[PDB]
Amino acid sequence: GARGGAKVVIEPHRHAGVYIARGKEDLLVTKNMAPGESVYGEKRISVEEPPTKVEYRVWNPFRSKLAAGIMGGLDELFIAPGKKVLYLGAASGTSVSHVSDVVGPEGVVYAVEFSHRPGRELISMAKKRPNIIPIIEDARHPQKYRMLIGMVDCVFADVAQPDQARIIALNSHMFLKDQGGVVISIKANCIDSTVDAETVFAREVQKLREERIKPLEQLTLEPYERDHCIVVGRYMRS
Amino acid sequence: NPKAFPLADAALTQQILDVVQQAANLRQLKKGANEATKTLNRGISEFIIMAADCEPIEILLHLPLLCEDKNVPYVFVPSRVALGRACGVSRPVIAASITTNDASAIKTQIYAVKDKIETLL
Amino acid sequence: MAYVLTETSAGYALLKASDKKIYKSSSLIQDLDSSDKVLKEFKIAAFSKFNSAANALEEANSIIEGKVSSQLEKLLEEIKKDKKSTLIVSETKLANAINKLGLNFNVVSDAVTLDIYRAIKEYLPELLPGMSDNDLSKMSLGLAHSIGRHKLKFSADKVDVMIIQAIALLDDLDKELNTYAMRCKEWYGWHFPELAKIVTDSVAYARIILTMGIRSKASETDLSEILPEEIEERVKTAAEVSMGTEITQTDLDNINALAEQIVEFAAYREQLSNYLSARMKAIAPNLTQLVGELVGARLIAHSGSLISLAKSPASTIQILGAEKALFRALKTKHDTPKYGLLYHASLVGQATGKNKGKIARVLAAKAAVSLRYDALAEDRDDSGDIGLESRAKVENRLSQLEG
Amino acid sequence: KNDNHIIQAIALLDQLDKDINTFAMRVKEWYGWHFPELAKLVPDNYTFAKLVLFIKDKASLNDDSLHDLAALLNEDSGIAQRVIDNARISMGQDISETDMENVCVFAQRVASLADYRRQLYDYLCEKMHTVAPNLSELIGEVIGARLISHAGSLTNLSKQAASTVQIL
RNA sequence: UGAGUAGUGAGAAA
RNA sequence: GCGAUGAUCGGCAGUCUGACAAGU
């Protein structure tokens, strides 16, 4: 359907830094910060604009949790051009590259990872993207990389860990600004598979409230993924 | 064998091998590391079974990297000779892949194992 | 007095807080919202900058381990003159480490200090004159990579992306040295056209021009080291009965410069060949044993990386370099290829007839087994042993299949 | 009267110019990993190889070395100060001594051909003045040589009519 | 196991 | 203070198959 040279019409999305490609089929796309290559083999779209050849990257929702969040219709995203983003659980550039695309050259992305083998792949991709500062360190102890990270307008955590709530608290307390962004990708099975999904999500919201983060909206990620939801909140230190 | 991780216990291994024999009878089983590698590429694998006692174990270590990227559950069984016999072949099998089929007659049993492997991961 | 130890990718910064118990105030957020008040509240005491990346990383590791570095110790000693002072520290472990030094500082690491370390981190570019935010990120990015390599056990001798370049360098040099050789043969052919037929080697062709510049010089010059006896005498006889015309010394000088270039490319081309082979014997020793260095390089280069090739099935490795023939056959309902890029491997050459196809399948499978070892083995011994028995198995298959 | 030397010079000079570009780009890639930013700082490829030859290791940064590399090219662009600062602060992963040995030797090759290319270019200009002083003076040594090669020989060019020369 | 390396030619300016 | 030494007019394009084979 969506072959490489099929000609499509690109329009902006409601959210700044996100684009939509029309045609027989619908695609979510982000401007390529590093044109002429694909981070993970994703389809790319060529546009001739006055004539300069700008390039766009297709965002696959089945691979990126955040993109599937776009299709479900998230009302507010703190990730936008010219904003500093702390990305936790940066296994590789599958999603970080697209997050790097949205923030653009002016913005920066602090990619945090623990596992070494995904880490080196993340390093190889940050070379193509100067705005990405890869941090191969445990998110459970933010003070290890505190020298390396300045302040961030939004914090994104896709970490699939049972104690992710503690990690989001410590990182948000350290590097997130007042009224800052907090967006979480929650998997029920990793936290507690014994109980049903809705029970898992509700308790995580309770932890978020205890740590001075107010939920703004919640969205399940079906049909793309099962038993997953994204929680959007704002951090009031007051 | 530290590298083979997470490794199934005795009760789990019997349950898995019960799946592999059934899928083999129903033609829902892909045998061999290379064929298992293909199934991940097409995204048609319910889950992959590897043998922990393979020497050198690395020859199947590519599949865990493939499985984690594609979010496909995986598990190690202690014995490869057992896996080959469960597969229904005369040769030892180090890796096997269960093909996705929501219209299969053994669909329920496969998902029961898949959930347990997901818990085990 | 209250002191704040702030750590940055550039260096260590010590801040004097006017309030001895600034960390005991509940309104720190409002008292530190803007840059101007932060500058008033905190004044730099001493700033120890990292001179080099190696120093910065040794400093960074000490921070991660909670150890007080020598630079930090010297920087703290400068403030030792202030009796009965408080040192606000971001980490408890570093606070404990600084306490053990016996310095005259009541070291405090409290949750309330996090706001002080928080508000400071909003405005670091403005607090620190002389360093821009873009520059600070560059220290951040660079120090992270340098720290990253050591944690990952990155080793300079195990990067395959040398191999992808070097093989692609080698092909280009092979093309280019040919074209220049053609030009030298044509241009020098004007002064002596008979040389190309006699000596066919381009490098030997250039060396002759260097040893003898003009045909008259041929009578006395010796071409023994370049040419054997029978060849060197024929060029001499050609020189006197030649067709080429006389050339000026100005013409001679530049054609010699080419001949100097021609011989030089061959020298480096051999060097790159030896450099490449050493690279393969460290990054993929097993494949070099089985398939070889040159063919192994083209396989890795075709996929673009060692991991990418490692994840491919043996079937694709068999026909990796025959896409045009493969897809032409697939569309036209005709037989598909069976050798691919592996055709030039030694084992394929030893096979004959239809056995070539069988060995290609067997060799490709064993190549995958060896390949997955080179790519995914954390503690691989640089011996190529898995290649050795893998080679042995195919040789036995070749012997029985041929027999 | 021989003018074939000019034709060889033009057919060779462009070959070097394309070829110098080809190798020089590769030098940028190899040294680019060890510290990429100089590939951005000095866009001129011919200049880049010399600075890599002098600045092999980014760690080696001295005020006297700053003056030495400042002498290379001019400090008007300010790259001399930028490289010292930016070398101190960069993400370029150090490559092995054998890798570094290749870069300088590989860079040394790019210097030689461009050096010879300059030498050959001078010889063309000297030769054109000798053979075709009128043509070389009227338009230039490089342009006149290209016209001669297009015609196939100076005798051919004189034979052609004015309109034919214009479309040549 | 199977399986392809041909510009025109005297006007122009006033 | 004119002119024959020249006026004028990315696509094709999709990365093969998978348990038998060889001997008396």
Curated annotation (Swiss-Prot), chain A:
Shown residues in whole-protein numbering: 79 to 323 of 327
Entry comment on modification after translation: Methylated by HMT1, forming asymmetric dimethylarginines (DMA) within a domain referred to as an RGG box, made up of repeated Gly-Gly dipeptides interspersed with Arg and aromatic residues.
Q: Which GO terms describe its biological process?
A: box C/D sno(s)RNA 3'-end processing; maturation of SSU-rRNA; regulation of transcription by RNA polymerase I; rRNA 2'-O-methylation; rRNA methylation; rRNA processing; snoRNA guided rRNA 2'-O-methylation
Cross-link Glycyl lysine isopeptide (Lys-Gly) (interchain with G-Cter in ubiquitin) per UniProt, renumbered positions: K65
Q: Where is this region: S-adenosyl-L-methionine binding?
A: 94-95, 113-114, 138-139, 158-161
Main subcellular location of this protein, as a coarse class: nucleus
The UniProt entry's sequence similarity note says: Belongs to the methyltransferase superfamily. Fibrillarin family.
> Oligomeric state and partners?
Component of box C/D small nucleolar ribonucleoprotein (snoRNP) particles that contain SNU13, NOP1, SIK1/NOP56 and NOP58, plus a guide RNA. Interacts with snoRNA U3. Interacts with MPP10, NOP58, SIK1 and SOF1. Component of the ribosomal small subunit (SSU) processome composed of at least 40 protein subunits and snoRNA U3.
Which GO terms fall under molecular function for this chain's record? histone H2AQ104 methyltransferase activity; O-methyltransferase activity; RNA binding; rRNA methyltransferase activity
Query: Which residues are reported to carry the modification Omega-N-methylarginine?
Result: R3
Provide the protein name: rRNA 2'-O-methyltransferase fibrillarin
Say yes or no: keyword Transmembrane present: no
Swapping A90V leads to an effect described as:
In nop1.3; thermosensitive allele showing a decrease in histone-glutamine N-methyltransferase activity upon shift to restrictive temperature
Q: Name one GO cellular component term.
A: 90S preribosome
* Compartments (UniProt record): Nucleus, Nucleolus
* Stretches for region Helical: 196-228
Give the modified residues of type Asymmetric dimethylarginine: R3
Q: Does the keyword Transport apply?
A: no
E.C. numbers: 2.1.1.-
Q: Which domain of life is it from?
A: Eukaryota
UniProtKB/Swiss-Prot annotation, chain B:
The main location class comes to nucleus
List the Pfam families: Ribosomal_L7Ae
Q: Mark the transmembrane ranges.
A: none
Keywords of this protein's UniProt record, alphabetized?
mRNA processing, mRNA splicing, Nucleus, Ribonucleoprotein, Ribosome biogenesis, RNA-binding, rRNA processing, Spliceosome
Q: Which Gene3D superfamilies match?
A: 3.30.1330.30
Its Gene Ontology cellular component terms are:
box C/D methylation guide snoRNP complex; nucleolus; nucleoplasm; nucleus; precatalytic spliceosome; small-subunit processome; spliceosomal complex; U4 snRNP
Q: Name one GO biological process term.
A: maturation of SSU-rRNA from tricistronic rRNA transcript (SSU-rRNA, 5.8S rRNA, LSU-rRNA)
Q: What is the effect of changing V77L?
A: Impairs binding to U4 snRNA, but not U3 snoRNA, and causes pre rRNA processing defects and an accumulation of unspliced U3 snoRNA
Cross-referenced InterPro entries: eL8/uL1-like, H/ACA_rnp_Nhp2-like, Ribosomal_eL30-like_sf, Ribosomal_eL8-like_CS, Ribosomal_eL8/eL30/eS12/Gad45, Ribosomal_eL8/Nhp2
Q: What GO annotations for molecular function exist for this entry?
A: RNA binding; U3 snoRNA binding; U4 snRNA binding
Task: Report whether RNA-binding shows up as a keyword of the record.
Answer: yes
Q: Where in the cell is it found?
A: Nucleus, Nucleolus
Q: How does it assemble?
A: Binds to the C'/D and B/C motifs in U3 snoRNA. Component of the U4/U6-U5 tri-snRNP complex composed of the U4, U6 and U5 snRNAs and at least PRP3, PRP4, PRP6, PRP8, PRP18, PRP31, PRP38, SNU13, SNU23, SNU66, SNU114, SPP381, SMB1, SMD1, SMD2, SMD3, SMX2, SMX3, LSM2, LSM3, LSM4, LSM5, LSM6, LSM7, LSM8, BRR2 and DIB1. Binds to the 5'-stem-loop of U4 snRNA. Component of the ribosomal small subunit (SSU) processome composed of at least 40 protein subunits and snoRNA U3.
The protein's name: 13 kDa ribonucleoprotein-associated protein
From Swiss-Prot, chain C:
Q: Where does the record place it?
A: Nucleus, Nucleolus
The Gene Ontology CC terms held by the record are: 90S preribosome; box C/D methylation guide snoRNP complex; nucleolus; nucleoplasm; small-subunit processome
Name one process (GO BP) from the record. rRNA processing
Task: List residues of cross-link (Glycyl lysine isopeptide (Lys-Gly) (interchain with G-Cter in ubiquitin)).
Answer: K281
Which stretches make up the Nop domain?
283-403
What is the recorded function of this protein according to its Swiss-Prot or TrEMBL entry? Required for pre-18S rRNA processing. May bind microtubules.
Q: Which family does it belong to?
A: Belongs to the NOP5/NOP56 family.
Other notes: Present with 34700 molecules/cell in log phase SD medium.
Q: What is this protein called?
A: Nucleolar protein 58
Q: To which species is this protein native?
A: Saccharomyces cerevisiae (strain ATCC 204508 / S288c) (Baker's yeast)
From Swiss-Prot, chain D:
Range of residues in the leader sequence: none
Q: Where in the cell is it found?
A: Nucleus, Nucleolus
Sites of the modification Phosphoserine? Answer: S153
Q: Subunit composition?
A: Interacts with NOP1 and NOP58. Component of the ribosomal small subunit (SSU) processome composed of at least 40 protein subunits and snoRNA U3.
What further note is attached to this protein's record?
A: Present with 13500 molecules/cell in log phase SD medium.
What does the UniProt record say this protein does? Required for 60S ribosomal subunit synthesis.
Give the family per the record. Belongs to the NOP5/NOP56 family.
Q: What is this protein called?
A: Nucleolar protein 56
Q: What organism, scientifically named, is this protein from?
A: Saccharomyces cerevisiae (strain ATCC 204508 / S288c) (Baker's yeast)
